[PDB]
Ligand binder design. Structure first.
Ligand SMILES: CC(C)=CCC/C(C)=C/CC/C(C)=C/CC/C(C)=C/COP(=O)(O)OP(=O)(O)O
Ligand SMILES: CC(C)=CCC/C(C)=C/CC/C(C)=C/CC/C(C)=C/COP(=O)(O)OP(=O)(O)O
Lengths: 292, 288
């Protein structure tokens, strides 16, 4: 009797009830509650004017990008110890870091599974899987560097050039993934999508300081954001020792003190002019398209 | 400026050998102590009948070694384990952020190795599908294990629930290995056998754990599951509740740990129940 139950278990595919699906989906369902700006989704609709994928294929590509985007935020908020995401408590503080890590990773592989419902043309299929794998590798390479510079500061002080190659991997990754899949499926805008990704990341960095995640949470997180990279390299270059050191000291506190965060922003505004430099840099990238 | 940007966006992302070493640090750390290599030695034994060519067999081994070691990095973060293979866990040295990312990164470097197994598009499709299905099963198994543990005492798993979970959590990488080998073989499936091997392997691991860190971690191990269900069934409220209180302490007190280990040994006889259950499983194969 014990034997037959073991036999039945080992001789059949692993069983998975919808009740269990609901238990381990909690972390992800929570983040779905507040949709974001849907910038990537709208980007997908627009781009389809030229690519012309059938409604059904397009829905799958959208689902894949939404799964990857949202799960990547679940992981990034654990990796940054972020208290808020889209104005609500982050999933890992509600369900725990362990379940949130496993759920986000599980969703990466469900996104992978959807890639098969895109086609049966073995030539195409292979190319699709390859695009997915390459860009998931690129995403993790960039995320890995961003995380390393932040957690081991001041071991490595990146240069503007180093930051830009990191963003090409980290932020450029899902934008290139989306576009490469759609382009592969069309009955090249990658360079434009790379620039768009760089502008998106630097702008996010800029706005987090200029201005829901909390007041300037990138400082509390110790991030080597575009403005900070400019500030540290500017102070190094000009021999501004006291301030170079104060920028590093503040980043290392991982502080939520609102006055210390503003102190740091004012050093960028008045001592290194890092805010004006970043605002200008963004406009210079945007003009490359406006002047195309 | 415009020129530099132009070259950046028109080229593949820049990634160096040094960058690769920086992000590999947490993985390289756990590979400093080999472990027993049960899975890779298993692969060799099984190839005696699968006869894969040495180069494909090596890629299967690499895929399995990357998944096994990256899964340990993640499992250790998920139960905040202080030690793995006699040394400090990677996340306590490189931090949780870098260790999550590196382990997740290696999951995809393992995926990439699957297209190096074959050029035949029919077979490739099959291999990728096998990899995808079992990574899904592994996460369903690991998510239930984590769920029951972190949500205790909401759900006390039964013996059958534990067995289904373990077949995915631990049996999952054993099945991936064998499915990939059977798919590639140039020569009856061994999946039922490997599923039972995975189950025995985990129950045996739970048994041996009893540092008894599974206690400090609040784990619903095979012996604990037997003890909780045993006490419930017999109306032994006090013992049932005592086992739960100790698990819920997430204690590092050796004295309190010994106390639970004795309840399991002398009051519920879970250690003996466990040992005999393993033997019953081993005979299921032997006596065949
Ligand atoms: C699976 C993926 C995509 C990545 C794996 C590796 C990881 C965790 C990378 C982190 C990638 C990341 C979070 C980059 C930052 C991109 C960015 C600016 C996100 C925020 O985009 P919004 O459009 O502002 O967010 P909403 O959806 O709330 O509007
Ligand atoms: C990518 C994979 C495999 C899974 C994804 C989801 C996760 C993180 C699952 C957890 C899987 C896990 C760690 C199961 C336990 C397996 C086990 C009993 C490991 C210990 O095996 P040993 O053979 O004693 O280890 P050594 O390598 O040190 O010898």
């Amino acid at each position: 009797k014990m034997e037959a139950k073991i036999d039945e278990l080992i001789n059949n595919d692993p069983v998975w009830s919808s009740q269990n699906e609901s238990l381990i989906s909690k972390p992800y369902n929570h983040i779905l509650l507040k949709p974001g700006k849907n910038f990537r989704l709208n980007l997908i609709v627009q781009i389809n004017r030229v690519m012309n994928l059938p409604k059904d294929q397009l829905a799958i590509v959208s689902q894949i990008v939404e799964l990857l985007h949202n799960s990547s935020l679940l992981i990034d908020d654990i990796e940054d110890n972020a208290p808020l995401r889209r104005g609500q408590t982050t999933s890992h503080l509600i369900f725990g870091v362990p379940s949130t890590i496993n759920t986000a990773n599980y969703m990466y592989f469900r996104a992978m599974q959807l890639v098969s419902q895109l086609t049966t043309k073995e030539p195409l299929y292979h190319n699709l899987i390859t695009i997915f794998n390459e860009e998931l590798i690129n995403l993790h390479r960039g995320q890995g560097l961003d995380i390393y510079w932040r957690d081991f500061l001041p071991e490595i002080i990146p240069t503007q050039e180093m930051y830009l190659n990191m963003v090409m991997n980290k932020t450029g990754g899902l934008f290139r993934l989306t576009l490469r899949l759609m382009e592969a499926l069309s009955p090249s805008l990658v360079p434009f999508i790379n620039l768009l990704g760089i502008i998106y990341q630097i702008r996010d960095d800029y706005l987090n300081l200029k201005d829901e995640k909390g007041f300037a949470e990138d400082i509390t997180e110790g991030k080597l954001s575009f403005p900070i990279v400019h500030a540290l390299n500017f102070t190094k270059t000009k021999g501004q020792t006291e301030q170079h050191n104060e920028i590093l000291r503040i980043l290392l506190l991982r502080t939520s003190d609102k006055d210390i965060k503003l102190k740091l922003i004012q050093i960028l505004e008045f001592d290194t002019n890092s805010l004006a430099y970043t605002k200008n840099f963004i406009n210079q990238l945007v003009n490359m398209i406006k002047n195309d």
